[PDB]
Design a protein around this ligand. Structure first.
Ligand code: SAL
Ligand code: SAL
Ligand code: NA
Ligand code: NA
Ligand code: NA
Ligand code: NA
Ligand code: NA
Ligand code: NA
Lengths: 147, 138
């Protein structure tokens, strides 16, 4: 019934992220959206003009994988993909008017997911966990840079 | 700001990249290392019990296990009381790389917590466990 105190950090993070992928599917699956697509959408939303290959590098996924996810968003009309004028083989990405309209819907699902996850967490604990997460995300980025 | 999930994805992503660098030469992935370690902790564990443990689909666990047995790290035997069931065991070869795998996991955590004190480190870990148990309920 209870969880092993054995599981390494990565395992627990995987469990948490696991439920988020499931939550996204159930809450936005009918809009033909997946966690990966949502990930790309938000990332592009926060940085219009970002290149497909840069998105590939950020998520550390291969070309085909990123292309397939980006292809579904474009098909849904949420993003537009254009050839980079300075390099015809690169693709500049942008969230469309339509895509910007669902961003809010996505943020609400994230908010609800977070409230559900921090059910047993006090206000102080939650803000502290978040603060710790940021510090660690910052460390992970340093690590990618170290190697 | 960035959703919580974004921060956790970023963190978990460095672990995925780290395993590739440290164990890629063994064609091992995050999923494979995880299964391999769990089987090592629970010899004779059932394939379906492993899938229920990770909260992953039967098809996914199966593809991950095929990778491990193809590399010779694990062996599968039909469950003696249900031939449509498989029981898992780490092989001699698999047991040879476990220590290396454990050192790698340990080193990823130490790298991530380099600017964390022992206590913050313990707390963060405790909270993740709490959030994880909740995730299971949800
Ligand atoms: O899921 C992510 O990786 C992500 C990254 C940046 C911003 C929002 C996100 O959901
Ligand atoms: O994503 C995981 O964490 C995972 C773990 C064990 C087996 C298959 C998997 O995809
Ligand atoms: Na954009
Ligand atoms: Na997708
Ligand atoms: Na590109
Ligand atoms: Na538009
Ligand atoms: Na979130
Ligand atoms: Na794999």
């Amino acid at each position: 019934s209870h969880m092993d105190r054995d599981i390494p950090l990565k395992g627990l993070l995987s469990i948490i992220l696991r439920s988020h992928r499931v939550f996204i599917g159930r809450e936005l699956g009918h809009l033909n959206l997946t966690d990966a697509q949502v990930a790309c959408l938000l990332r592009i939303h926060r940085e219009p003009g970002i290149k497909q290959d840069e998105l590939a590098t950020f998520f550390h996924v291969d070309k085909g994988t990123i292309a397939r996810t980006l292809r579904r968003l474009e098909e849904s009309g949420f993003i537009e993909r254009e050839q980079d004028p300075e390099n015809r083989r690169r693709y500049i990405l942008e969230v469309t008017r339509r895509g910007e309209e669902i961003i809010p819907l996505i943020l609400k699902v994230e908010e609800r997911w977070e409230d559900l996850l921090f059910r047993d967490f006090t206000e102080d604990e939650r803000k502290l966990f978040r603060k710790m997460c940021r510090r660690l995300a910052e460390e992970a980025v340093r690590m990618r840079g170290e190697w």
